[PDB]
Structure 1
Amino acid sequence: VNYPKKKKMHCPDERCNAHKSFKVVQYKAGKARLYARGKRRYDRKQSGYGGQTKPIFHKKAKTTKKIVLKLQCSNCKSIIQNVLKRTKHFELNDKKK
């Protein structure tokens, strides 16, 4: 599918409270932190002689992912997240037929 690079949307912030221009970026997950609480616990459990202590999930079945868009207001720079339906190909063009 094709998505515009900019769109006009309502900004709920008290500074705007109107329809403003929003820039569009695609969402990508951040890098997993060492010293996050879940990672610290997992590393403690894994050290020693036991082996592998948690499942690993080999049986993958889905071929797509949902698309998340980060929309940033022109003023007040607030970010709103939106979810689209799953697609195999996604692109931003901002140019019609």
Structure 2
Amino acid sequence: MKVPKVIKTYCPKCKTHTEHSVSLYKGGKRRSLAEGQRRYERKNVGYGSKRKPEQKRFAKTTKKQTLVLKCQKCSYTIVKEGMRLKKLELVE
């Protein structure tokens, strides 16, 4: 599905409708020193079995496509709810 690069929606910081630049969401690096990564490493020291459950059965084939909209006057960003699609063709 095709989506424009620029969309005019409500900027809640500016309190009016402004232009936004559209991009797809992408996550960051896992960042060792996160509290749940410090705890996992503390659990893997010593002897034992595999410590934690790991997923093996997979059913879905797509992923929810999320749109990221940045207000072009104040850089305020609104993140929208995702929707299961193949690959959002963001070309204008």
TM-score in terms of structure 2 length? 0.94
Structure 2 residues not aligned, in runs of 5+: none
Structure 1 residues not aligned, in runs of 5+: none
* Structure 1 residues 34-83: Cα deviation after superposition (integer angstroms, max 9, x where no partner): 01000000101111111311011111111011011110001111000012
Aligned partner of 1:10 in structure 2 is: 10
The count of aligned residue pairs is 92
Aligned counterparts, 1:6-85, within 5 A: 6-13=6-13, 16-85=14-83
Displacement after TM superposition at 1:24 (Å):
0.5
Deviates more, 1:16-25 or 1:81-90: 81-90
TM-score in terms of structure 1 length? 0.89
Displacement after TM superposition at 1:84 (Å):
3.6
Counterpart AA for 2:67: L
Taking the aligned partners of 1:84 and 1:40, their CA distance within structure 2 comes to 30
SS in 1 for 2:39: helix
Q: Which runs of 4+ in 1 moved over 2 A?
A: none
Taking the aligned partners of 1:51 and 1:36, their CA distance within structure 2 comes to 24
* Structure 1 residues 4-25: Cα deviation after superposition (integer angstroms, max 9, x where no partner): 0001001111xx2111000011
Please say if residues 66 and 83 of structure 2, whose CA atoms lie closer than 8 Å, have aligned partners that are also in contact.
no
User: Root-mean-square deviation (CA), in Å?
Assistant: 1.0
